[PDB]
C-alpha cells in the first residue's frame, strides 16, 4: 500500500507540473531566489523553503516514507506563500488555485 500510495503521489506531482496548470503553477516550479526576486528577508521569515522541484528531487530520491510526508512538503510550499505574502497578492491567488488541485487529487487517492 505504501509504494502504491507514492506512485499516486508521483502522479499528482506530474499533474502539478503539467502545462494544464502552468498559468498558476509556474511560480512554484523552482525554489524562491530571494536575491533575484529582491525578497531579501525571505529566509528570515520562511525557515523551511519548499517548491515542486525539491519535492520531485525528494520523490525520485525515495526520501518520503509515506504519502503523508509528501503531502506535508506540498502544504509547506503553499503555507510558506500564505505566510510570507499579503493575502491579496497575485501569487497567493495562484497558490490557492494550485492547492485546490492538490487537495482534490490527494483526497481521491484510492
Ligand atoms: C514580487 C514580489 C513582491 C512581494 N512583496 C512582499 C512585501 O509585501 C508586498 C509584496 C512579495 C512576493 N512573493 C513572491 C513569491 C514568488 N514570486 C515569483 C514572481 O516571479 C511572481 C510571480 C507571479 C506574480 C508575482 Cl506578483 C510575482 C514565488 C513564490 N512565493 C512567493 O512568495 N513574489 C513577490
UniProtKB/Swiss-Prot annotation:
UniProt subcellular location: Nucleus; Chromosome
Name of the protein described by the UniProt record: Bromodomain-containing protein 3
Illness: A chromosomal aberration involving BRD3 is found in a rare, aggressive, and lethal carcinoma arising in midline organs of young people. Translocation t(15;9)(q14;q34) with NUTM1 which produces a BRD3-NUTM1 fusion protein.
Domain of life: Eukaryota
Whole sequence portion shown: 307 to 416 of 726
Cross-link Glycyl lysine isopeptide (Lys-Gly) (interchain with G-Cter in SUMO2), sequence positions: 108
Subunit structure: Interacts (via bromo domain 1) with GATA1 acetylated at 'Lys-312' and 'Lys-315'. Interacts (via bromo domain 1) with GATA2 acetylated on lysine residues. Interacts (via NET domain) with CHD4 (via KIKL motif). Interacts (via NET domain) with SMARCA4 (via KIKL motif). Interacts (via NET domain) with NSD3 (via KIKL motif).
Residue stretches making up the Bromo domain: 1-109
Positions of transmembrane segments: none
Job description of the protein: Chromatin reader that recognizes and binds acetylated histones, thereby controlling gene expression and remodeling chromatin structures. Recruits transcription factors and coactivators to target gene sites, and activates RNA polymerase II machinery for transcriptional elongation. In vitro, binds acetylated lysine residues on the N-terminus of histone H2A, H2B, H3 and H4.
Domain notes: The Bromo domains specifically recognize and bind acetylated histones. The NET domain recognizes and binds the 'KIKL' motif found in chromatin proteins.
Family (UniProt): Belongs to the BET family.
Tissues expressed in: Ubiquitous.
Amino acid at each position: 500500500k505504501l509504494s502504491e500510495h507514492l506512485r499516486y503521489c508521483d502522479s499528482i506531482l506530474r499533474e502539478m507540473l503539467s502545462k494544464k496548470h502552468a498559468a498558476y503553477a509556474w511560480p512554484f516550479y523552482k525554489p524562491v531566489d530571494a536575491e533575484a526576486l529582491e525578497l531579501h528577508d525571505y529566509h528570515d521569515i520562511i525557515k523551511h523553503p519548499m517548491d515542486l522541484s525539491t519535492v520531485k528531487r525528494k520523490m525520485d530520491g525515495r526520501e518520503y516514507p509515506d504519502a503523508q510526508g509528501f503531502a506535508a512538503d506540498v502544504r509547506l510550499m503553499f503555507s510558506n506563500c500564505y505566510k510570507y505574502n499579503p493575502p491579496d497578492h497575485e501569487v497567493v491567488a495562484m497558490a490557492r488555485k494550485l492547492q485546490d488541485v492538490f487537495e482534490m487529487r490527494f483526497a481521491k487517492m484510492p
